[PDB]
Design an enzyme around this catalytic site. Structure first.
Site, short mmCIF file in Angstrom:
data_model
loop_
_atom_site.label_atom_id
_atom_site.label_comp_id
_atom_site.label_asym_id
_atom_site.label_seq_id
_atom_site.Cartn_x
_atom_site.Cartn_y
_atom_site.Cartn_z
N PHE J 48 -6.16 4.82 -3.91
CA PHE J 48 -4.82 4.87 -3.31
C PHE J 48 -4.57 3.83 -2.23
O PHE J 48 -3.83 2.88 -2.46
CB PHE J 48 -4.55 6.30 -2.85
N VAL J 49 -5.16 4.01 -1.06
CA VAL J 49 -4.97 3.01 -0.01
C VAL J 49 -5.58 1.67 -0.44
O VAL J 49 -5.04 0.60 -0.17
CB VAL J 49 -5.58 3.47 1.33
N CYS J 50 -6.70 1.75 -1.16
CA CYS J 50 -7.49 0.57 -1.51
C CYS J 50 -6.72 -0.60 -2.15
O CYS J 50 -6.84 -1.72 -1.69
CB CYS J 50 -8.67 0.97 -2.39
N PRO J 51 -5.95 -0.34 -3.22
CA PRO J 51 -5.18 -1.44 -3.81
C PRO J 51 -4.17 -2.05 -2.83
O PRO J 51 -3.93 -3.26 -2.88
CB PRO J 51 -4.43 -0.79 -4.99
N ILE J 54 -6.10 -4.57 -0.71
CA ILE J 54 -6.47 -5.76 -1.47
C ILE J 54 -5.24 -6.64 -1.74
O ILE J 54 -5.28 -7.85 -1.56
CB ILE J 54 -7.19 -5.39 -2.78
#
Lengths: 197, 195, 197, 197, 197, 197, 197, 197, 197, 197
Positions: J48-51, J54
């Site tokens: 969730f937060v990850c993309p 990036i």
């Protein structure tokens, strides 16, 4: 329970003071290379079974020497005690004059190396070792205190080992000179087993 | 090795072939009797069958002196049984009345100090154990030379005699031979008489 | 170099088989509580200085007994050797009949506890211990092998320790019964030092 | 109990400050090579038995020096205390002028190496050591605090060790110069035993 | 370098034999609870700086007792030496009669606990400790051997600690009775700093 | 409780950042070889007794420099705090300009090496050290927090150690320049003790 | 004694006595370099599942040799037992003549190296290992005692590993010769996945 | 090389998050008690052989379920990855339609317990485990990376273990339902061997 | 590198003396339970970036207090230094007007617990910790010495953690109040991703 | 809690497989020598937060590259997962084409070296590291899972560290290019402080 005495391995080296022909001499295991050696320990000078075993071997020494074999006895007693015992008449439980060396092991080092030392008693049990001409240990016989060993069985074993050393056949149970032996191979063994049965 | 003379023989238990059947057997099954307990290197070899047969064919000489005999090796019970079912003429045992104990794990052999680490089987080790479970005698032979039923008998007889009487047995003692009172004065009855 | 024998501490416990009046008996250090004990080790039965020390104490034993003091000798020899040695005439270097118990230390445990065991030799040196009636070790005398001990000196020491146990006094160098003693305090001591100076 | 002092081995090396002829000098064990040495410890300067032992050896020093033997005394006291004690009159419990060195062992290192240090008291017991001309320890005498040593027994021991060094005969119990000695072998010993008995 | 002496912690416990008014008595640190104690070590009886320090405190003892403070001195010397030194005239470097107890530390345990023992020398350096009535160590003064301590400085310090114990304030460098003190507070301290500047 | 500061041994090496005449400079113990050094720790910049001690030494610095002696102060504060404190007026508890280096020991390494660090507080007690021109530690003075040190006593001590360094006589209790000293010899000492008494 | 058998690592070395065409021969793992090897353990000569496995592989040996693969069997039985079992008729649960070497592992060293030894039982489980021509272990199959292995599956696996060794494409579940394989690349893989689906 | 997975012992417990019917669910090994379980690891989501294995077993799930057997697959990927892979069409190398749980082992705990984790690669090899309805591990199959497993062999094995569990006869090499089995007794075995031969 | 500060675990407990409203008070981490806490270390009082950080947070304290958050700063300096620095005008690099506590960590215990202590320097780096109302550590920001932290980023982070605490949606990169958030589920997340793309 | 990532020390070396331009390439930290590097870990691909993190860096990449700064992201996912995620549309929570390398850390070695690995979860938290052109770690930013990082703050910090590397100046709280800086010394600092206030 520990010991350096292992069958098929070199007998543990030993050296010490022995009484030989009434005199104190230094004796070493390596002195016996080239000959079989019956090396045996006994509990205590001036006791009961012990003199009978020492005398039995001593009085039959030629049965060993005639087959290139020597005999040495060892105990935790001193050389002075060995000599005093030799100078004690057989009728008084002494040894009388004796033709086999009596080795002294006051420090217990030799007994411990051979695994025959009794920590609770401060002497050995009745342990006998047959060592070959190459210094390899072939046989171990250990008796509890109240029962003496057999010169005749010791002779049979020496003859058996010399026979198998020389011929490469193996010796069945109860083998004595003249007895049938076995070719140690799955095919060769049948000569023995078919002829016996 | 846990085998120490004058101490309790190391306990053992395992599967043995007895009367051609597999049975669990324990050292304690023999309490109250003397036991000749012996190891041999390998089923289907050479000296070994001669030893088992020598003892087996003379078993009654032991049983009549309240003594039992048990043989042990690192072979399986299936191998023991196949060997029993192999004719003596082919280096087999034929029927046999001595239990053949199996020591596949080597635990029993190691406890008795007879296991050969380089070879994966035992040497020729024989143990005489008394009716109280005390180890009295150890005989270890290198591989090429078989043991003696005559000497084993002599030893069992000597130990039973000294157990009973408390006199001790001279070199070469056999039934009927002279024995010694283990006392500085008493011993003279033996030494004086003999000499 | 270790040992359990510490002056002013309880003498290390011991027990073993001893020859007492020609018979084998179990003997323990604690059997001597209530009495002073001269407890001495000697190297080896059937040797040279050793019998002279045992005989010297033995023949003067009443001088000790009369002052509530017993004497016990010990070596690494067996009880059978002790008895055989007793049965050996003095003229042949034997003991003859003896009233001092001869203790056997086959395992070397007692000798090691008293710090008198010679690891290279397998026997003890000439170690003598004076133990009081409370079991406390008071004196240690250790001689190398070639030189025998002294019964006179041992007697003098026993008397001195008994005297200092009983009285509020200490014994000067060379004290014997009847000699001047010192009151061990900065003022009392002057009665001694003024008297003899 | 630990110690570096072992009979038949080299006496443990020591060095320190000694009072000699009323002056402070460094002194080493190796200074006495070539001579026998009676090296002895005493508890405490300004006490009771100690001065009597120091005075006894000092006043009889020629009995040692005329047989190639020296005497050295040692305690845990300082060299300043040794000197003040020398400067105290004998009638006050002092030493007066003295001809044997008084060695100081403030760190207790020497005492501990000789096994004579008392951990609960902070001083030594009465330990005396006889060291031969080759620096080998031959004799150990340890007394509890209340009882002084004997100069006469010390002389007898020195004489006996010198005699056995020289002749290779051994000295029976209570031997003094002029006494019978023994040839230390099973046959030779009979000269002594047959003669005495 | 180790020690149990830590400022602001209970002074390490000690007990031992002291000479007090010519007699041997057992003395304990806890005997001084409820009073300040100046407890100091000195190297050696019968030496040079040492008696001057003992005498300097001794002759001014009432200046300490008038402020509820006791003084005890201690060395690695024996009580017998302490007494002999007391009985030595001052003109010969002795103490003469002394009212300060002289504690003996033969085992060196007290010295080591206080971190003043010289391992290379076998005695202490010149170490002085100020211990308060609650048994808490407040001050440690350690001098190398050649230089004596100061009774005046010791008195100043005892007075300063007593002052700060009693009042809220702390003592500046060089404080003596009657000098200005400081309120240990960021605001209060200004009364002092503004006055002097 | 440990430390590397041992009297009569080389003072533990230190190096760090000091404030010297308003600047940050690296300073090392070895920078002071060839001179005596009074090296002292104080608890905390901006506190109470600390500035009085720093100022007391700083204002009398020439009395030290005229006897070849330097002074360095150290605390666990930063060099930035030292400088800010220097720039704080004395009337506010600041130092004002100062000619004594102020050494910073943020890591506490130096404080721990000298055994003056207080683990519960995170700063030092009042520890002062006198180090000679050869770098040998001669004196240790440790005060609890509420009581400042003395410049007079510190000067006396430096003078004493310098005197004994030069003349090899020793300084009695309370010695000041011009006072009687002692020849450290059992005979030599009488000149002092006879004179005085 | 941990298992050394790790997939993608060199198979643990082994050497021992094997029965090969009725004769005893020394056999080594390295004798098989250059060829794939199916190396399998079975519990016990003269049992039940075991002979069926040895015979199953034995009778289909040419299917392995035609794909450059050898087969070796191993158990904790002796070579003498292997030979006796080979000389036992298949109708009696024997092997009959056999073209696969029967390796003996009396010491259990090999079984333990391969992680197939049963500590409670004294023999192995049914462990089969596929080792490639470089000596790298590629596959491990371990069956509990009552269930035999499969020659079909073993062949399939040898073929798959040889295929992937050659082409670098990888083999899907259930792969057999003639089946589709996959290019191990994110884009290349689609040729397989798209065709199949 | 270690592992907790041992044939004939309880299979190592595991629990974690699985994707089941498109949803995240916690799943435990114990959920499968009472049924056989084929539990298998595969290297990596979105790779090559792996999807073909998951699909092969999954598409044939009824052949397991109709014999009371379940199937669970596991890798070191996350549950989010498992789900995205399920949502990827088979023609793109995804899993598409699926009915077997995909267990996630992000921490590698489960993989290490089963001995299938590759420390150099950060994922698992192709390890398959057959666990019986009592939770006992019966079979271990490990393949190097490039070669997939076989659904048909796995089924044969599950059927064989169920058969031997049920009847107490054992399964020869290559057994399949309907094949001959053996009575595991030296006499009973002959029914099989005489019939087959 | 070691520390007790672990995100998602309880922030390590601390307690110590702080300057609050110009007074010394004891302060504890637990005094802040029920509120978020920005807890930050700075290197050194009277330096450069440090006062700008203390001032930046302090001057904007209401932006924290209005969202139930407090701020506390800490260094290895003393409370006396903290107070002196507060009393220094901002134009001189002082703190001047202040409302956040300044915690003192003289012993370095707190700094070490939080993993921000620099062993080579004796002070901390620029470490900031965001701790939630339940005392759980949520965020760690560590800056090397030359670069100051950001009040605005810290506020953003505090707001983000509170938002996610309350709503259970998660905050994308760069989130500020009013920004889109994400439902942390494979289906729910699509609301965010579809909308934004 | 340990880690090898220490500010002001060389950043811990790493190497591994990354996706770059849609292809797998080996990548090493040392590859970035001579440039600043923003190296950040994110929990999990397909979450969730990850993309968002990036993409946020990816879409502003030229703002970094134009200041000689590169960006690399890392997770415990495989390279195959990274590429699959890249090929997932942004509207489905994918990355779409990306110019930031995505490093794979399957073994967790890199994550553990940087202290960001969560043992309980099997993935990393949100840890970001700023590494200068000499390979020295300058800044660490660690966020708990639910809150994303900030590209603005990351750029500000990179600018500040580059600025402080180039100039003899340090950056106040909240500094951005064009903001006032401080000269880090007690005198120079006043130019900043006087001007600001």
């Amino acid at each position: 329970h520990l010991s350096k005495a292992k069958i098929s391995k070199p007998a543990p080296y030993w050296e010490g003071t022995a009484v030989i022909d009434g005199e104190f001499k230094e004796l070493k295991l390596t002195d016996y290379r080239g000959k079989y050696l019956v090396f045996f320990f006994y509990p205590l000078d001036f006791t009961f079974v012990c003199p009978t075993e020492i005398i039995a071997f001593g009085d039959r020494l030629e049965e060993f020497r005639s087959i290139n074999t020597e005999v040495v006895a060892c105990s935790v007693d001193s050389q002075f005690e060995h000599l005093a015992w030799i100078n004690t008449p057989r009728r008084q439980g002494g040894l009388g004059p004796i033709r086999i060396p009596l080795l002294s092991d006051l420090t217990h080092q030799i007994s411990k190396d051979y695994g025959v030392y009794l920590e609770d008693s401060g002497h050995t049990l009745r342990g006998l070792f047959i060592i070959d001409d190459k210094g390899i240990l072939r046989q171990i016989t250990l008796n509890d205190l109240p029962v003496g060993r057999s010169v005749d069985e010791t002779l049979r074993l020496v003859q058996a080992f010399q026979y198998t050393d020389k011929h490469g056949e193996v010796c069945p149970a109860g083998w004595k000179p003249g007895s049938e032996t076995i070719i140690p191979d799955p095919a060769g063994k049948l000569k023995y087993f078919d002829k016996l049965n």
